[PDB]
Amino acid sequence: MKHTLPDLPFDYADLEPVISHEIMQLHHQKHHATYVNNLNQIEEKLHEAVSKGNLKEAIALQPALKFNGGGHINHSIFWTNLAKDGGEPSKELMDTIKRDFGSLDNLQKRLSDITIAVQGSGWGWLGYCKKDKILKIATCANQDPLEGMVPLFGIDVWEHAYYLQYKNVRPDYVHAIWKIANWKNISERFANARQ
Amino acid sequence: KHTLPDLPFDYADLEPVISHEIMQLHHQKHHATYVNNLNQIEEKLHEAVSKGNLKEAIALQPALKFNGGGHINHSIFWTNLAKDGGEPSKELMDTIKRDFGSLDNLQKRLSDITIAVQGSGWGWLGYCKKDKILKIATCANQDPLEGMVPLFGIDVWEHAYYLQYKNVRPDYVHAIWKIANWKNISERFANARQ
Ligand SMILES: [Mn+2]
Ligand SMILES: [Mn+2]
């Protein structure tokens, strides 16, 4: 069925002073909504090419599906990943963070560093690899969804995610976002990944 | 579901430019494998799409492009080769002269970019409908030619030449011109023009 823009789990000003209401409103109501609207159109075109047996046309639509579909997936996760009252990692997630990264401080530094280092637009991710049964960190370009591991916590480093507030100073945003990481949600995603 | 197209000639008909053993493996194993895998990948994709698993549907894209591109590219390729392909039509020769100077210049330029492909891929002569001009391009792996109409393709995956030419890819790329099916290429040009 048709994709829709999910409501935010909070009001647009609820993450201040870490992310402005200006940013939250544009990011959700314009940027995410555009991915949803475009995704619905691209899925319809792809379904048509598949049904008509137009293989070249189906292949040609793949970048648009990955871009808008990835945009929808990424931002849908990102909204649930943010909270004013995030809380603390679950006992099991904390244990696993300690096992895989030494400490929460180490994880935060390492993920912040690779996220800050993204050239152009993209995302940093904490994920869970089900095959190796370990936490891992990665970056993705543009809206490429995190693949091969289950996403737990994502940091959007497209310039639109921070520029109105932070201007060029991307590291201030990336370090600050940890203050609003929704550990309740991240812990739920971790529990789900290990089932 | 997709099927392996019959060759329009017998397996030894392109000798001495491309051997019987190459044609047999290239058609019956390599192209067949793309067809078989393409059919399986389409079914995995439909299940992902019908169940609403957008993430999995995106994850399956590289396999569709690779196997689907494999099927597309080789299906064109077989029609592009002939023991006695003739010469370009007058209209095609005129356009070749317009856009490249001469057939000699087009052959040199396309051979050069095709030889220069790093790893596996294809060289293409194509017709761009927007700008109404012939162009040359290369594609990586099995990526189909996009944004122009394919007219003549040169497979430079090592399996296309290795048994006969070994490491000497340039001798193969230069020699394939001897078996270019200009009857087919000229027809593809005429269709691209309308
Ligand atoms: Mn964004
Ligand atoms: Mn081949």
The domain spanning residue A115 has which CATH number? 3.55.40.20
Residue A107, token pair as written in the block: 């994880």
Q: Are β-strands A150-156 and B121-128 bridged in parallel, bridged antiparallel, or unpaired?
A: unpaired
The reply to whether B85 touches chain A by the CB within 8 Å rule is no
Among the candidates A83, A104, A128, a domain finishes at: A83
Ligand with an atom nearest the CA of residue B71: 2
Distance from C-alpha of A155 to C-alpha of A175, rounded to nearest angstrom: 10
Distance from C-alpha of B74 to C-alpha of B142, rounded to nearest angstrom: 9
Check CB contact under 8 Å for A73 and B54.
yes
The domain spanning residue A66 has which CATH number? 1.10.287.990
B106 within 8 A of B121, measured Cβ to Cβ? no
Residues 6+ apart with CB under 8 A from B33: B70
**Backbone dihedral angles phi then psi of residue A159, each to the nearest 5 degrees:** -60, -30
Residue B161 counted as domain residue: yes
Judging by beta carbons within 10 Å of its beta carbon (0-12, 13-18, 19+), is residue A24 exposed, middle or buried?
Answer: buried
Cα(A71) to centroid of ligand 1, in Å? 7
Residue A139 counted as domain residue: yes
Torsion of CA A44, A46, A50, A52, to 10 degrees: 60
Residues B98 and B156 reside in one and the same domain: yes
Residue A40 counted as domain residue: yes
Judging by beta carbons within 10 Å of its beta carbon (0-12, 13-18, 19+), is residue A91 exposed, middle or buried?
Answer: exposed
Residue B181, token pair as written in the block: 């099916």
HSE-CB for B170 with a 13 A CA cutoff: 5
Residue A4 counted as domain residue: no
Residues A92 and A187 reside in one and the same domain: yes
Domain total in chain A: 2
**Backbone dihedral angles phi then psi of residue B121, each to the nearest 5 degrees:** 170, -160
Residues A97 and A76 reside in one and the same domain: no
Among the candidates A35, A56, A83, a domain finishes at: A83
Query: Range of B87's domain?
Result: 83-194
Task: Tell me the shortest Cα–Cα distance from A69 to chain B, in angstroms.
Answer: 7
**Helix residue ranges, H only, A31-90:** 33-52, 55-60, 62-80
Among the candidates B82, B111, B133, a domain finishes at: B82
Residues facing residue A12 across a β-bridge: none
Distance from C-alpha of A76 to C-alpha of A137, rounded to nearest angstrom: 19
Resolution in A: 1.8
Report the residue from A3, A55, A69 with minimal CB separation from B58: A69
Cα A133 to Cα A96, B55, B59, B70, distances in angstroms: 10, 20, 21, 35
Experiment type: X-ray
B161 within 8 A of B14, measured Cβ to Cβ? no
3-state class (DSSP) for residue A151: strand
Task: Tell me the shortest Cα–Cα distance from A61 to chain B, in angstroms.
Answer: 10
Cα A185 to Cα A64, A93, A154, distances in angstroms: 29, 11, 12
CB interface of A with B, residues 149-168, below 8 Å: none
